[PDB]
Design an enzyme around this catalytic site. Structure first.
Site, short mmCIF file in Angstrom:
data_model
loop_
_atom_site.label_atom_id
_atom_site.label_comp_id
_atom_site.label_asym_id
_atom_site.label_seq_id
_atom_site.Cartn_x
_atom_site.Cartn_y
_atom_site.Cartn_z
N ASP A 3 0.79 14.26 16.44
CA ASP A 3 0.66 14.37 14.98
C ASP A 3 -0.77 14.11 14.49
O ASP A 3 -0.99 13.40 13.50
CB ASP A 3 1.68 13.44 14.25
N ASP A 50 -1.27 6.64 13.87
CA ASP A 50 -0.07 7.50 13.83
C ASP A 50 0.82 6.72 12.89
O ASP A 50 1.52 5.81 13.34
CB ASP A 50 0.53 7.65 15.23
N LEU A 94 0.86 -1.19 0.00
CA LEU A 94 0.00 0.00 0.00
C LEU A 94 0.89 1.24 0.00
O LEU A 94 0.74 2.11 -0.86
CB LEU A 94 -0.96 0.02 1.21
N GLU A 126 5.01 3.00 1.65
CA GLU A 126 6.33 2.87 2.25
C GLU A 126 6.76 4.18 2.88
O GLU A 126 6.40 5.24 2.39
CB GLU A 126 7.34 2.47 1.17
N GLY A 127 7.53 4.08 3.95
CA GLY A 127 8.10 5.20 4.69
C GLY A 127 9.57 4.94 4.93
O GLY A 127 10.13 3.99 4.37
N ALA A 128 10.21 5.76 5.78
CA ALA A 128 11.63 5.60 6.09
C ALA A 128 11.88 4.43 7.03
O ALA A 128 12.91 3.76 6.90
CB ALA A 128 12.19 6.88 6.69
N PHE A 129 10.95 4.18 7.96
CA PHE A 129 11.08 3.14 8.97
C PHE A 129 10.22 1.88 8.74
O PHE A 129 10.49 0.85 9.37
CB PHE A 129 10.82 3.73 10.37
N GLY A 130 9.23 1.95 7.85
CA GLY A 130 8.37 0.80 7.59
C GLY A 130 7.66 0.74 6.25
O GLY A 130 7.65 1.71 5.50
N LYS A 131 7.05 -0.44 5.97
CA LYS A 131 6.28 -0.74 4.74
C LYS A 131 4.89 -1.27 5.14
O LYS A 131 4.82 -2.18 5.96
CB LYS A 131 7.00 -1.81 3.88
N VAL A 132 3.80 -0.74 4.54
CA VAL A 132 2.44 -1.21 4.85
C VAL A 132 1.85 -1.96 3.65
O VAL A 132 1.80 -1.40 2.56
CB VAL A 132 1.47 -0.11 5.41
N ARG A 179 -4.63 12.81 7.68
CA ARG A 179 -3.78 11.77 7.05
C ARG A 179 -3.50 10.63 8.08
O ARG A 179 -3.17 9.52 7.68
CB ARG A 179 -2.47 12.37 6.50
N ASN A 180 -3.64 10.91 9.39
CA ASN A 180 -3.41 9.91 10.44
C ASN A 180 -4.70 9.25 10.92
O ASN A 180 -4.70 8.59 11.96
CB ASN A 180 -2.56 10.49 11.58
C1 LIG Z 1 -2.19 4.12 5.94
O1 LIG Z 1 -2.90 2.89 6.09
C2 LIG Z 1 -2.63 2.12 7.19
C3 LIG Z 1 -1.61 2.38 8.09
C4 LIG Z 1 -1.45 1.57 9.21
C5 LIG Z 1 -0.39 1.86 10.19
C6 LIG Z 1 -0.37 1.65 11.54
N1 LIG Z 1 0.79 2.17 11.96
C7 LIG Z 1 1.28 2.29 13.32
C8 LIG Z 1 0.31 3.07 14.19
O2 LIG Z 1 -0.78 3.48 13.78
N2 LIG Z 1 0.80 3.42 15.41
C9 LIG Z 1 0.13 4.08 16.41
C10 LIG Z 1 -1.20 4.30 16.58
C11 LIG Z 1 -1.31 5.14 17.69
C12 LIG Z 1 -2.63 5.57 18.23
C13 LIG Z 1 -3.00 7.03 18.18
C14 LIG Z 1 -2.71 6.39 19.49
N3 LIG Z 1 -0.12 5.45 18.19
N4 LIG Z 1 0.78 4.79 17.38
C15 LIG Z 1 2.18 4.95 17.61
C16 LIG Z 1 2.67 5.04 18.91
C17 LIG Z 1 4.03 5.16 19.13
C18 LIG Z 1 4.91 5.19 18.06
C19 LIG Z 1 4.43 5.11 16.76
C20 LIG Z 1 3.07 4.99 16.53
N5 LIG Z 1 1.50 2.67 10.94
N6 LIG Z 1 0.78 2.48 9.85
C21 LIG Z 1 -2.33 0.51 9.44
C22 LIG Z 1 -3.35 0.24 8.55
C23 LIG Z 1 -3.50 1.04 7.42
N7 LIG Z 1 -4.57 0.74 6.50
C24 LIG Z 1 -5.75 0.13 6.80
N8 LIG Z 1 -6.48 -0.08 5.74
C25 LIG Z 1 -5.74 0.44 4.68
C26 LIG Z 1 -6.27 0.38 3.28
C27 LIG Z 1 -4.56 0.95 5.13
#
Ligand SMILES: COc1cc(-c2cn(CC(=O)Nc3cc(C4CC4)nn3-c3ccccc3)nn2)ccc1-n1cnc(C)c1
Ligand SMILES: [Cl-]
Length: 285
Positions: free
Chosen positions: A144, A162, A16, A18-24, A148-149
């Site tokens: 943040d 996030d 879906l 890519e970023g600097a630290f991960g791939k989704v 977009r989040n």
């Molecule tokens: C952009 O789409 C998605 C991107 C993610 C995803 C998830 N994460 C990690 C992530 O969301 N982390 C996170 C959430 C929170 C909550 C607000 C409190 N806090 N932190 C957090 C905390 C400390 C350090 C770094 C993060 N990164 N990417 C997943 C599905 C999706 N997608 C679904 N369906 C589709 C089609 C996509």
């Protein structure tokens, strides 16, 4: 108490983002709740401690308006984090495709193409506010908050995450102050821009900016301005203009989030209560 998932149970479909630290990736997951769609975050790389801290935090954070976390896959490499799949992708993209030009953008078969109505915009706003009420209750600072989040699932279900892959396709929403520190300046109040002071009060300011993004159908705040000009306008105390689709009562809520002194900003609980009351009043009208 992090849930572990066997690698054999995860079938990757495609990348879906890519970023600097991960791939989704979009993926299928077996024996989680047979054949379920999920979104999988792969760790690219210290990094293992940040991954562990995140997995523990996401296991603990449980709310209907916080992105659902299913567990991790620590067997082999790369390390994986399994999240729910939200059909309509991120809220910024969703707003931009369900705006005034939705008919131009729509696929031939799309259901009732057109701009989201007031009732829908208030339901999106109230859901994001509910997630922020939950985080504030835990003394958790997001830092943040932006459309977009957020993710949108079928039935206009909105949840906060996030993502940091947000820092790639939305790299323009961040200002590099130095090295690797990327600040989402257009969503930040003066104390965060000037001194990196992040609190539940700087999150409520960002929630006010989210309300503006919602009511402009995903426009970038201060879009007319460069990063340095936006920094100057925000620190000078300039306020974003009322959006054309924004009722005056919703703009009054944005203004409450944007009080200059952090302690004078309205609490997220009162902001959510007001949004929920406006959504209820409009339901049948
Ligand atoms: C952009 O789409 C998605 C991107 C993610 C995803 C998830 N994460 C990690 C992530 O969301 N982390 C996170 C959430 C929170 C909550 C607000 C409190 N806090 N932190 C957090 C905390 C400390 C350090 C770094 C993060 N990164 N990417 C997943 C599905 C999706 N997608 C679904 N369906 C589709 C089609 C996509
Ligand atoms: Cl006002």
């Amino acid at each position: 108490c992090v849930h572990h998932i066997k690698r054999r149970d995860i079938v990757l479909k495609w990348e879906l983002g890519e970023g600097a630290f991960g791939k989704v990736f979009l993926a299928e997951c077996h024996n989680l709740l047979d054949k379920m769609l999920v979104a999988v975050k792969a760790l690219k790389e210290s990094a293992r401690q940040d991954f562990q801290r995140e997995a523990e935090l996401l296991t603990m954070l449980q709310h209907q308006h916080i992105v659902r976390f299913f567990g991790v896959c620590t067997e082999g490499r790369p390390l994986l984090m399994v999240f729910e799949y939200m059909r309509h992708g991120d809220l910024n993209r969703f707003l931009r495709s369900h705006g005034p030009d939705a008919k131009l953008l729509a696929g031939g078969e799309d259901v009732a193409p057109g701009p989201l109505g007031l009732g829908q915009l208030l339901a999106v706003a109230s859901q994001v506010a509910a997630g922020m009420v939950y985080l504030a209750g835990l003394h958790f600072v997001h830092r943040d908050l932006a459309t977009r989040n957020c993710l949108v699932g079928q039935g206009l279900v909105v949840k906060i995450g996030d993502f940091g892959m947000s820092r790639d396709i939305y790299s323009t929403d961040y200002y590099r102050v130095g090295g690797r520190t990327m600040l989402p300046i257009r969503w930040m109040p003066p104390e965060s821009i000037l001194y990196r002071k992040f609190t539940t009060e700087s999150d409520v300011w960002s929630f006010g900016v989210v309300l503006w993004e919602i009511f402009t159908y995903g426009k970038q705040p201060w879009y007319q301005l460069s990063n340095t000009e936006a920094i100057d306008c925000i620190t000078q105390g300039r306020e974003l203009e009322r959006p054309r689709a924004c009722p005056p009562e919703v703009y009054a809520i944005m203004r409450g989030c944007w009080q200059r002194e952090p302690q004078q900003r309205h609490s997220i609980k009162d902001v959510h209560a007001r949004l929920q009351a406006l959504a209820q009043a409009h339901h049948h009208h």
